[PDB]
Ligand binder design. Structure first.
Ligand code: SF4
Ligand code: SF4
Ligand code: SF4
Ligand code: SF4
Lengths: 420, 445
């Protein structure tokens, strides 16, 4: 009974993230995916390329050699091909591995130009003032909508601006997709007294009225993630990124048609793990992920920012911090030794970490370096974590819609009493 | 003791020998898509509640607005308050986010591209060459297992394979010229023939949509709707589960087409376009046709949406299923009695279409689909009362008698609570989700 467990472990109100007076908002360019010190990696031939192009070279090499992963023979070349075809297809509704550019492509900050909004314009739902301002009813409505939109977990928190990127990585508005990767730029995210989210030439402007963040958990497939670092773990990762994108769009449209505004984000705008912890989805862990009672860390996160009045959820403590202090299994299994075996500190290990918050400090350039080597997105830490509990057998074995598991799907049933 | 329900056993018990179960005669011709009630000039226009004659969906918009202002969730159906009325229409409208003009029917436009070459995902992945490398698997048995696994990842609750029967492919599609932007699309619709020719890849010219003669197979997906919400038909929450499933259909088509392309084959998406989904679903064994005209499945009854993808990927066709729907529909008639427009016949099946909207030459129950569409502006939604009242839509129809499975004949003798009630991811129901579990023996024999 997940509803039992979650109420049993509810904390009193208040962000559980411990900060000091040195904490500053973090520039998105500093992540290992984007920072110039980490973006380039060698491929297996010794050629230095953007990390994902070197990883592509390893995927091709593996298919040619009939492998599903590094030193992991597939049943045959056909099976190797199928795993990479499934992975590539999963990313269909995602731009450049994460949808990070705000107010571009799928991540529009206004619904006005969307084909769906245009078709529905005669009804005027996005221009009519709200008919409901009660946060209790709105919380029930928007959480119901979030489940329809594909969230397996949903939570609400007040927006902590500490976790919003100081500056986003984006592209100029008129740059076509084919030039996007070569024309990424940095752009400040600022808060101002304005009626609606708006982007100028100089700034991404979030209204000061943007009170709340809605955080969704999108469950990955257990059998597929257990093949990490091989291709089927890459495929469940990929499919869930497209599920994230559809969730954001559906939910933003619902909120707009209720008379409020909504900012989608997927992997952009801010740090999902921090939002997820403050919204009570789970607890932060040694590997750096939000660990949930239902899925452990084997769940993806996305979030939507809104002025819709809502009731914040309570943070939860089910003992993850104390379990991680003695466990260290992810740190021992990590192929790049990226994950620390030491205690939590306020001091980042490198430019990629945000200093000023008490956390396990991991070396995320070491992690990214393993991705071209293995030809994937690893995930071994997620796979081995106790809270999460060959490839031919996966393809021949159990599956169900969206990779969900009917042995556990009852755990995410929801009634009004657990929504608000 | 009660035998634990087993959807795979049920499908195995009622499997037929190979062969299209649809009975046809010499009158059969391919059907021009413009003839559907949504598009034909005789049915496209409907009065609104003030008597003004408009495109059907604009007259229905007028009724949605009227209901919200009057605090109603449907025709004569009072909501708890105006905010609840508003919330149901906001959910319905949002559900349609990934669907163009109520069904994604224009082929090779917007989401329904016939080639992946211009897609942002294909461009990002181009260095791997998955869409240019020849197939590494040509064995239909392994391909069927691979593609059905992918189909489940892509959100299908049911998946089946049939050889493509061109009788159900539209003779001419409804589409728009390639230079027309979205905001003009509804004013610029045209017809364009769908033809089969000896070409290597699906291709569109100025004059024709060309499907290769190598396009052997159709993959049909069932996308389950939510039972609690459909039971509110014809009110707004039934409209919302309908809408959300159309966007699920779109995601399914794009995901699966990309998988098939990255396996070295071509793939044509369709959603509500290209051809007649119910006929493909019957031939792929998802279910049986019914009095209301829908495909009734063992797992969901007719409370399931359909989409399909066409491909040259070698595959193993599934067997059709006969679990007695025809004989139950012969005596049931509940959808005909409850239909608010009297669109559904109470008579026998014939080969003769009731009107231009029906394709003559196939043995089916002939329904008046102009009457159906006429109730949509009146009710401000997409009705669905027939789906809601069908006994097969109940979750509880199957019983085991110690020897075999059978249908319980006894089954044939508000919105606030929905918003406050049970829900789960994508509106799926964990009490029944085990019914769609799949292993290799389910996917290919
Ligand atoms: S994804 Fe792999 S390399 Fe990265 S931290 Fe986890 S185990 Fe280590
Ligand atoms: S593997 Fe152990 S130490 Fe690492 S995150 Fe999981 S519980 Fe914590
Ligand atoms: S309501 Fe009765 S007659 Fe109509 S489709 Fe269902 S079983 Fe057939
Ligand atoms: S949708 Fe409604 S009007 Fe149309 S056939 Fe079904 S019950 Fe009749």
């Amino acid at each position: 009974n997940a509803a039992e467990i979650r109420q049993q472990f509810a904390m009193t109100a208040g962000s559980p993230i411990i900060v000091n007076d040195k904490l500053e908002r973090y520039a998105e360019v500093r992540t290992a995916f984007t920072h110039p010190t980490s973006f380039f990696k060698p491929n297996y031939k010794g050629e230095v390329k953007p990390w994902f192009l070197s990883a592509y070279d390893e995927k091709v090499r593996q298919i040619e050699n009939g492998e599903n992963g590094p030193k992991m023979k597939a049943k045959n070349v056909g099976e190797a091909r199928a795993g990479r075809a499934l992975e590539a297809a999963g990313w269909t509704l995602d731009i450049n591995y994460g949808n990070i550019y705000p107010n571009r492509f799928f991540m529009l900050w206004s619904g006005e130009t969307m084909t769906n909004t245009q078709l529905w314009a005669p009804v005027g739902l996005d221009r009519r003032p709200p008919d409901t301002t009660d946060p209790v009813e709105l919380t029930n409505y928007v959480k119901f909508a979030a489940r329809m939109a594909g969230a397996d977990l949903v939570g609400v928190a007040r927006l902590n601006r500490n976790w919003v990127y100081s500056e986003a990585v984006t592209i100029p508005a008129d740059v076509p997709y084919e030039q996007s990767l070569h024309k990424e730029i940095e752009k400040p995210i600022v808060f101002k007294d304005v009626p609606l989210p708006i982007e100028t030439d100089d700034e991404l402007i979030i209204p000061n009225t943007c009170e709340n963040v809605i955080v969704a958990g999108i469950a990955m497939n257990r059998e597929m993630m257990q093949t990490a670092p091989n291709s089927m773990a890459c495929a469940t990762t990929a499919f869930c990124y497209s599920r994230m994108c559809m969730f954001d769009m559906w939910l933003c449209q619902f909120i707009r048609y209720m008379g409020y505004y909504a900012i989608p984000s997927c992997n952009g705008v801010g740090q999902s793990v921090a939002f997820a912890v403050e919204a009570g989805l789970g607890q932060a862990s040694r590997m750096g992920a939000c660990i949930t009672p239902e899925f452990g860390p084997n769940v993806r996160l996305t979030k939507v920012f809104t002025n819709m009045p809502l009731v914040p959820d309570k943070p939860i403590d089910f003992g993850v911090t104390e379990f991680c202090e003695t466990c260290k299994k992810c740190a021992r299994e990590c192929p790049s030794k990226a994950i620390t075996e030491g205690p939590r500190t306020f001091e980042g290990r490198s430019i990629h970490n945000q200093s000023g918050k008490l956390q396990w400090q991991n070396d995320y350039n070491k992690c990214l370096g393993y991705w071209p080597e293995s030809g994937g997105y690893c995930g071994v830490c997620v796979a081995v974590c106790p809270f999460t509990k060959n490839i031919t057998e996966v393809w021949d074995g159990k599956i169900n819609t969206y990779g969900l598991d009917a042995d556990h799907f009852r755990d995410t049933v929801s009634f009004r009493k657990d929504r608000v």
